[PDB]
Amino acid sequence: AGLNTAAKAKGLKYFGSATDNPELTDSAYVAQLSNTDDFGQITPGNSMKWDATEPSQNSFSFANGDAVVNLANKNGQLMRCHTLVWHSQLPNWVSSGSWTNATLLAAMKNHITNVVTHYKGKCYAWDVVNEALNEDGTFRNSVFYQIIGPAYIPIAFATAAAADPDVKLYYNDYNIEYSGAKATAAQNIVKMIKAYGAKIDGVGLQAHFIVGSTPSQSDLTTVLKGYTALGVEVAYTELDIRMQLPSTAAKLAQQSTDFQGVAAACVSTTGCVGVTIWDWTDKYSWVPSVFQGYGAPLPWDENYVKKPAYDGLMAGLGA
Ligand SMILES: *[C@@H]1O[C@H](CO)[C@@H](O)[C@H](O)[C@H]1NC(C)=O
């Protein structure tokens, strides 16, 4: 029994984990990442982003993305492919370009087509557009929004669907897990894509939460159902629950209940297909370098030992 067996027993497609290429040289890490009792699905943390896959214009590079796919293939795990259009981790040629609408669109479409076609048949889902919203629900002023306007979003989805018509296409974002302007604006992106006549299959809720300040099971579920009502599926795509350090037994127990609610909200909502944690061990979490004074966010500690949050997750999944 483990997270992925329990998830599947409740009708979810998977419980999964992100990873990154340098971690695949750690034997012990790879052994646990490869334990399909716990993980039925993998997301590449960095090697399918634009700077990795198209470091110069029309010059694609897939070796590192492929290495993650190969590991999922060896294990029989599903892949989520992450991410086509995003304002972060762009190569210099995109950011520094003197663009027109026509020339940026051409570059964006060529990016999407190339990368999606390369991974055709290999991915459960793609995060097609990531983080397009500001917290108030207005559109983020990325290069894509400044040059192309809002149509970049549906154009991106239509391009992806043309290159691989079977893969689930997701809009992915953070702070759209709880009721508010940003979640309403995420519902509105789903509606906009469909009004354009483009395909969207899923909403990805990143779920980067904080211990003792995580949305309640009730509000998480209201929000999930807000998206599933629209005829899309949903998933928690980058779950982690960062704690203000130092770690204590009380914070670890809080963290357990916070993870428990997330799993339980997913099981509660028909059309929630899965949960991915953003890596699985505190040793390799992205959190401490970005969020000063915060850490210990995942269900295993830095020594690869289960924390109480593992049992929270199991409880939330009814195991
Ligand atoms: C860019 O071109 C597209 C496709 O023709 C169009 O939908 C969109 O409105 C244009 N945007 C701008 C800012 O001109």
Side-chain angles (χ1 to χ4, degrees):
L3 304 169
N4 183 61
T5 72
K8 292 192 301 169
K10 293 283 157 165
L12 272 56
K13 298 179 180 313
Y14 59 83
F15 197 98
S17 181
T19 194
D20 200 8
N21 291 253
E23 297 164 39
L24 300 189
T25 68
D26 180 337
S27 292
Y29 174 92
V30 170
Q32 175 52 23
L33 189 67
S34 304
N35 178 351
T36 63
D37 298 335
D38 283 327
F39 309 117
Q41 174 271 324
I42 302 295
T43 301
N46 286 299
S47 54
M48 286 185 192
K49 295 171 180 174
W50 197 312
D51 67 344
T53 54
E54 196 185 1
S56 294
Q57 190 171 354
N58 309 316
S59 283
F60 292 90
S61 167
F62 297 113
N64 286 335
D66 285 7
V68 183
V69 177
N70 290 343
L71 177 57
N73 192 274
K74 178 180 189 179
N75 302 331
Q77 294 158 317
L78 303 179
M79 284 295 301
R80 294 183 84 268
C81 291
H82 174 83
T83 179
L84 300 168
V85 181
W86 185 36
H87 69 281
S88 193
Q89 289 176 269
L90 294 167
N92 186 274
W93 72 269
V94 175
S95 294
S96 72
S98 79
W99 301 113
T100 66
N101 189 24
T103 53
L104 187 62
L105 266 174
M108 187 192 83
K109 288 171 68 163
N110 185 62
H111 183 75
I112 292 168
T113 295
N114 274 276
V115 174
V116 172
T117 301
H118 179 84
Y119 290 113
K120 189 176 189 200
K122 297 170 186 190
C123 301
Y124 173 75
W126 269 104
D127 296 325
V128 180
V129 180
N130 199 30
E131 297 184 2
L133 292 168
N134 299 309
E135 297 305 305
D136 62 13
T138 61
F139 292 111
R140 186 187 294 273
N141 78 332
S142 64
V143 63
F144 308 106
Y145 184 76
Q146 292 178 343
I147 295 296
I148 307 168
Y152 85 92
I153 294 164
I155 295 169
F157 278 80
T159 307
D164 182 350
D166 301 337
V167 60
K168 299 274 193 228
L169 305 177
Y170 279 60
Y171 173 71
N172 191 61
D173 211 341
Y174 65 91
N175 289 345
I176 60 160
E177 320 84 357
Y178 57 83
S179 297
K182 203 183 183 179
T184 295
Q187 297 173 345
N188 294 344
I189 285 171
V190 175
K191 300 180 195 186
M192 174 197 47
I193 292 162
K194 292 168 169 285
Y196 271 69
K199 187 160 89 103
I200 176 169
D201 305 298
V203 178
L205 290 95
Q206 292 184 12
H208 297 292
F209 293 148
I210 297 171
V211 177
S213 301
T214 293
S216 66
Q217 179 181 339
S218 292
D219 194 51
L220 289 172
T221 301
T222 286
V223 169
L224 296 179
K225 291 178 180 170
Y227 300 116
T228 60
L230 306 175
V232 295
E233 72 187 36
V234 298
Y236 289 117
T237 54
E238 314 180 9
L239 177 59
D240 53 24
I241 308 191
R242 58 184 182 276
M243 75 170 68
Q244 183 175 66
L245 298 173
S247 177
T248 75
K251 299 170 179 184
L252 287 164
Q254 185 64 38
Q255 178 177 64
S256 181
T257 70
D258 296 337
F259 271 101
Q260 188 174 354
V262 180
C266 184
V267 168
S268 291
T269 301
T270 302
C272 185
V273 300
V275 175
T276 305
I277 54 175
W278 208 239
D279 223 317
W280 56 270
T281 166
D282 296 340
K283 182 174 210 197
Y284 296 126
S285 180
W286 72 301
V287 161
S289 56
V290 174
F291 299 96
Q292 201 188 116
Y294 287 80
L298 292 168
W300 288 255
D301 73 19
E302 72 280 15
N303 308 131
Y304 313 162
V305 179
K306 291 168 183 178
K307 295 158 64 185
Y310 183 92
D311 301 324
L313 278 168
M314 295 288 283
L317 296 167

